[PDB]
Amino acid sequence: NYGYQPLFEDRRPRNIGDTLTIVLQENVSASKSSSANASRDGKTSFGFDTVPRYLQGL
């Protein structure tokens, strides 16, 4: 005797020793990315090509 068995219920595992089908379908995907930047450019100039007389000493 295997005990009471439901008639219309779907066949499910209920006790120790019962079998069950596992459909292994795994799809995992993780990603991450980052960046940082900094820039600085500086140019400066001053030139006196021709200096008038009253400015010579300066």
Partner: protein
């Protein structure tokens, strides 16, 4: 015979039971089974339990 008609005894109560089944022997007035997949699914379950694998 009035107290039995006016009161109820504590612990003497009724419960409700529910279940699912199939009714056969209809004269073409059953499920269409195209819009009710569970009818055919449970009929197949019963047949598999009885030893027939459709």
């Amino acid at each position: 015979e009035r107290i039995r008609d006016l009161t109820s005894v504590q612990g003497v109560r009724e419960n409700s039971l529910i279940g699912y089944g199939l009714v056969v022997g209809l004269d073409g007035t059953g499920d269409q089974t195209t819009q009710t997949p569970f009818t055919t699914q449970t009929l197949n379950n019963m047949l598999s339990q009885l030893g027939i694998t459709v």
